[PDB]
Amino acid sequence: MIKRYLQFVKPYKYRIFATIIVGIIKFGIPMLIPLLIKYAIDGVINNHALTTDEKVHHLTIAIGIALFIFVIVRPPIEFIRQYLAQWTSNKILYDIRKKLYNHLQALSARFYANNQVGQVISRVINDVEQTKDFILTGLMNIWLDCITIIIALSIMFFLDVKLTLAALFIFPFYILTVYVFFGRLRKLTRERSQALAEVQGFLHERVQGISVVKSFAIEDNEAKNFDKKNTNFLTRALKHTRWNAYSFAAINTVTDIGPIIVIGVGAYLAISGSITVGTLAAFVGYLELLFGPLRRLVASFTTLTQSFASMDRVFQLIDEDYDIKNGVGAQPIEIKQGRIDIDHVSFQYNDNEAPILKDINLSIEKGETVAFVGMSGGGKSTLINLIPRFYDVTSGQILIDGHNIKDFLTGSLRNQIGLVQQDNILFSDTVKENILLGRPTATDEEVVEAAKMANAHDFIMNLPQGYDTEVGERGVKLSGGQKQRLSIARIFLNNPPILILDEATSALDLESESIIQEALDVLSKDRTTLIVAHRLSTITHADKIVVIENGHIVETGTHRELIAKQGAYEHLYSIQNL
Amino acid sequence: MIKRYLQFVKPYKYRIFATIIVGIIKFGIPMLIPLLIKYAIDGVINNHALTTDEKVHHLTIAIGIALFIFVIVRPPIEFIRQYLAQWTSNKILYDIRKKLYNHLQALSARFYANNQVGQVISRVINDVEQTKDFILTGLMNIWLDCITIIIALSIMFFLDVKLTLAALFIFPFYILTVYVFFGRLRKLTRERSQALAEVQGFLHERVQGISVVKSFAIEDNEAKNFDKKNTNFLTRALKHTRWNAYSFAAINTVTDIGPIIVIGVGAYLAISGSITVGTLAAFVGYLELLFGPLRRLVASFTTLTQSFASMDRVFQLIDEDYDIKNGVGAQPIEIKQGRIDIDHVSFQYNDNEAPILKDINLSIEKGETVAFVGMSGGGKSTLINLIPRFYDVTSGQILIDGHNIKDFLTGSLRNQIGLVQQDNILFSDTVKENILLGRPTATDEEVVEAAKMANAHDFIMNLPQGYDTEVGERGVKLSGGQKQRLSIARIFLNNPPILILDEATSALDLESESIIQEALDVLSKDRTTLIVAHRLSTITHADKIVVIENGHIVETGTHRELIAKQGAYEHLYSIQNL
Ligand SMILES: Nc1ncnc2c1ncn2[C@@H]1O[C@H](COP(=O)(O)OP(=O)(O)O)[C@@H](O)[C@H]1O
Ligand SMILES: Nc1ncnc2c1ncn2[C@@H]1O[C@H](COP(=O)(O)OP(=O)(O)O)[C@@H](O)[C@H]1O
Ligand code: NA
Ligand code: NA
Numbered sequence A, B: 001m002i003k004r005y006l007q008f009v010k011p012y013k014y015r016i017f018a019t020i021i022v023g024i025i026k027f028g029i030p031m032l033i034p035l036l037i038k039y040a041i042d043g044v045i046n047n048h049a050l051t052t053d054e055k056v057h058h059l060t061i062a063i064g065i066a067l068f069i070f071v072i073v074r075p076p077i078e079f080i081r082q083y084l085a086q087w088t089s090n091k092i093l094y095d096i097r098k099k100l101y102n103h104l105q106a107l108s109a110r111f112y113a114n115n116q117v118g119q120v121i122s123r124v125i126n127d128v129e130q131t132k133d134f135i136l137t138g139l140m141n142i143w144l145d146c147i148t149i150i151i152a153l154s155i156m157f158f159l160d161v162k163l164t165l166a167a168l169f170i171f172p173f174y175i176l177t178v179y180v181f182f183g184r185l186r187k188l189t190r191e192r193s194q195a196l197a198e199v200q201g202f203l204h205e206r207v208q209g210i211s212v213v214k215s216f217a218i219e220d221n222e223a224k225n226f227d228k229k230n231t232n233f234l235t236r237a238l239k240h241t242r243w244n245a246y247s248f249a250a251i252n253t254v255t256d257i258g259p260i261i262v263i264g265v266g267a268y269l270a271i272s273g274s275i276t277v278g279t280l281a282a283f284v285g286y287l288e289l290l291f292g293p294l295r296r297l298v299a300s301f302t303t304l305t306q307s308f309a310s311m312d313r314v315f316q317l318i319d320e321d322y323d324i325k326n327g328v329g330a331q332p333i334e335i336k337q338g339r340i341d342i343d344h345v346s347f348q349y350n351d352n353e354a355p356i357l358k359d360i361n362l363s364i365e366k367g368e369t370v371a372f373v374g375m376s377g378g379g380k381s382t383l384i385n386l387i388p389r390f391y392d393v394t395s396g397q398i399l400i401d402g403h404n405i406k407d408f409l410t411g412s413l414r415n416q417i418g419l420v421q422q423d424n425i426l427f428s429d430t431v432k433e434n435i436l437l438g439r440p441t442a443t444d445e446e447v448v449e450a451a452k453m454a455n456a457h458d459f460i461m462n463l464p465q466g467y468d469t470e471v472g473e474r475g476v477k478l479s480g481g482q483k484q485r486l487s488i489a490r491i492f493l494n495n496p497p498i499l500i501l502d503e504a505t506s507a508l509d510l511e512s513e514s515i516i517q518e519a520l521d522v523l524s525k526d527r528t529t530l531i532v533a534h535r536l537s538t539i540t541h542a543d544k545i546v547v548i549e550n551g552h553i554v555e556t557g558t559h560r561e562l563i564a565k566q567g568a569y570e571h572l573y574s575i576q577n578l
Helices: A002-024 A028-045 A062-106 A109-113 A117-130 A132-159 A161-168 A170-215 A219-270 A279-290 A293-318 A380-384 A410-415 A431-438 A444-453 A457-461 A480-494 A510-523 A559-564 A568-573 B002-024 B028-045 B052-106 B109-113 B117-130 B132-159 B170-215 B219-272 B277-285 B293-318 B380-384 B410-415 B431-438 B444-453 B457-461 B480-494 B510-523 B559-564 B568-573
Strands: A340-347 A357-364 A369-373 A395-400 A417-420 A498-502 A528-532 A544-549 A552-557 B340-347 B357-364 B369-373 B395-400 B417-420 B498-502 B528-532 B544-549 B552-557
Touching: A002 A062, A002 A132, A002 A293, A028 A062, A028 B219, A028 B277, A062 A117, A062 A132, A062 A293, A062 B170, A062 B219, A109 B170, A117 A132, A117 A170, A117 A293, A117 B117, A117 B170, A132 A161, A132 A279, A132 A293, A161 A170, A161 A219, A161 A279, A170 A219, A170 A293, A170 B052, A170 B109, A170 B117, A219 A279, A219 A293, A219 B028, A219 B052, A279 A293, A279 B028, A340 A380, A357 A380, A357 A552, A369 A380, A380 A498, A380 A528, A410 A417, A417 A480, A431 A444, A431 A480, A444 A457, A444 A480, A480 A510, A510 B568, A544 A559, A544 A568, A552 A559, A552 A568, A559 A568, A568 B510, B002 B052, B002 B132, B002 B293, B028 B052, B052 B117, B052 B132, B052 B293, B117 B132, B117 B170, B117 B293, B132 B277, B132 B293, B170 B219, B170 B293, B219 B277, B219 B293, B340 B380, B357 B380, B357 B552, B369 B380, B380 B498, B380 B528, B410 B417, B417 B480, B431 B444, B431 B480, B444 B457, B444 B480, B480 B510, B544 B559, B544 B568, B552 B559, B552 B568, B559 B568
Parallel strands: A369 A528, A369 A544, A417 A498, A498 A528, B369 B528, B369 B544, B417 B498, B498 B528
Antiparallel strands: A340 A357, A340 A395, A544 A552, B340 B357, B340 B395, B544 B552
């Protein structure tokens, strides 16, 4: 998996090597200070053989050299070091999200039917952000602390063989301890993030559905439900905290026995006649070089553990399966004559549940306008959505122009099916911007046409700022009949070969309906049109009315014929002016 | 404003003092090492008074002691120090969100009509989280670095009053520099966060409206729109980064001239007689004590700057005004007889725009069932929503039982108005859980009753896992007629004195409608009922039909009478059979 995440860093290797290089070229600076203390002390006064005009000159080139380095060289190193580090990771994150967003847009209705927006977003934003440390603390810092440890171990190896050994004794345990915690922290972090994710999901869902919370004044009740999730998150976060605290003390207690098992030994050797009490003096001086980095790495460790958890969650989301896939055979197909064929189609949203569409057989010739009617919960919408291939038929096949829906390239198929769903969507944008969804590359002229078509153009003008009026989030700032008509607009703009209208009149008064009815009868003149309707009267003119009951096609016919049959259809119609 | 944020920390002062105390009791440890070293070296090795059996002995007491401290005392200090620090801040955050969520639930339809969920959430989650550093780096660490600076400075002052003035020389500039950057970083951070906020808002809106993006296969187009926001965020984040890098190098270059100017003057002063090398050398070992903390504080500074930006944004959201406020006169009023009076009401959603309801006068006696009908975009919904007081009338007054709506306590008023909006809501929960929204404290028996009432109980049983079937996010896993009926359920459960039904039939077939029609005619027998409808036929029985046009009441009457008048009403009705 590191290999995976690494793939994102790939195009930035150099900038990172650079960040590490400049990183090393930093320790040289802190050492310049103690080096300068020795020069004035031993090179201008303890020299004893210099003029009081000569030594007061060397101190003006040494206090000259220092200033130069620190006021000219260091600043740029400092800067670049950070800017680089950041610029790098920040571009990397940017990249990861670029990919995650396409992933999302490629998931299926199913996915989104069983997932919580807020939770998904939490991953795309928070979890990703969290993997930032892995680039910084991981690939750009950890090393410097190891380089330091090598240098140190090395220097010590010369000063004395067994004395260094005296140190390395700790090392294995240190490693063992890290290993012991790592995993548990990784989970605790994972579980923590997830909780956050769930509060995200909650906030999203409620803030957007407040209308309801407000209406029944269930604020108190819901504020509770919030606290459960908010608390859960807190709890989990504490578990996580406790362990970090715990593991920290642990790893360090080990890292601390380090200088001890050293000093102790360093004495019982210098005195036992093994080595120069100067060696002991020198060696023990470097103790900070060894058990310093080892102490930092404890922190480095921790940070990473958390980061891994995050990249987990990220990849987990990345690894989600696309339910509707294109498959090798993919083929952008032009639908020239709207010929739709539903052969023995049967649908189930899940293996466990019962099918919703059982055995459906229906043929729709180009130009025909087919109406779908029946008790609510029958299957019309489900059936319908099988064509734009929003879900794949369970058993059977649907063919447009003889071509199996599956053999089209998604975008192609879908782009040629103008679909007005029953629960229509609007983004917090401008009226124009919303219609444009039907055909983003459209002439401000064509838009206004669609509008006039959908019987929308008129009320749009009466809107403050007309076609540029910002509709509300979710399109709140408009009537039902109004939102709806904008959806119809999109259709005309799309001007597709196949038109599916699932209750495209729901919210319009009798009059507006009449208009749109005419507008459509026109657009639907020579196109294959599928219509789901409850307001029968606006379906009579259909070429064929299809009655659907409990997932089955029960009746088929012309309004006229169906009425004669005094069957299922008539029953329903008959309920109107009776 | 710090005072504000502090108010959240208040109930945790002690835990924080504690965190600081234990914090100080830490420097004592690192010093024990060199002490065990000096003690070994200068104490046992060169005592010139030690039996080889004594020195070894006194060495051992120094180690047995070391191990004890480090393997027993330190671990607990380390732990508590962190656990404390975290536990504290983490509870504080928890608290802040507890408050933010109630704030949210108290904002008005307006607020939410002009705000983006994702953006709001970003604040409640991200910005808050960000204020975490302020508690940690701010109130628990900064101090230790100042304590260190005091300790250090004192020593310098007693070592030489005029050389500490060679040090402190830097101090003012340091302060000046911080001041110079602070502000700009605060903004850059602010602007950065906001960008994130906007990507949040984008992701929310799109992920939830994908149905549309999928239908027109506008994935590519939208993926672009995403990249604008994603890029914007990246850019802003870079600006921020660049400056931090910049300001960091700056403040340090200043902090670095520090040890130098002590050496520049200090050395010159030794020459002229200020003091000797014995002093210049001793005034230089502690240099790390002074310009060490000053270097850390540079980082401490930065972190805080960002934190302030965050608390800004947080408070900004906290400072949002409640459009619908209760006001002192608040009074939980029982509505005993649904008498509604609309006296010269006029409504405008904004001062700039044109009113939507102009001069409306209508009286509704207890028990009466009043229907509202008219072209779409007329004002019915708006009018209606003025009663549950979702917005306050602009000019006029609405009185229930003689009491002005404004004089009720929100929850009271709203709780007694059973409202079925046209765009009904469902949470990703169970069927039961959703109905329960109407009356959270309800008998599993009463629920099933409401269901049977709303003509829902039946199809709910046919659902996998029946009343416990998890409907989809937003309630996707159900038909239109199905979601809707659950909304109707809530009404029966609420069983209020006043019932408002805005197109409560939109998605039901003719048959289901008949049922619910009967179910309601019953529940509406002796209750004040307001109905907005487009399917006229389901309104005929009304006590009074009110026709609304361009924000006005144009006609008033009994279906019978209005039909006779051959006016506005008849026109519309007349369009059904015609
Ligand atoms: N997104 C979904 N996930 C799972 N099941 C669904 C989903 N949408 C619909 N269904 C199932 O299909 C049935 C609804 O079919 P329906 O859409 O109401 O046909 P119609 O729209 O003509 O009334 C429901 O009983 C429900 O259980
Ligand atoms: N949330 C809102 N914010 C701002 N304006 C709104 C909002 N909701 C409705 N409106 C305005 O009110 C008008 C709609 O009134 P409308 O709801 O359609 O009455 P009705 O439902 O009877 O047709 C629109 O023209 C719109 O500009
Ligand atoms: Na047609
Ligand atoms: Na009534």
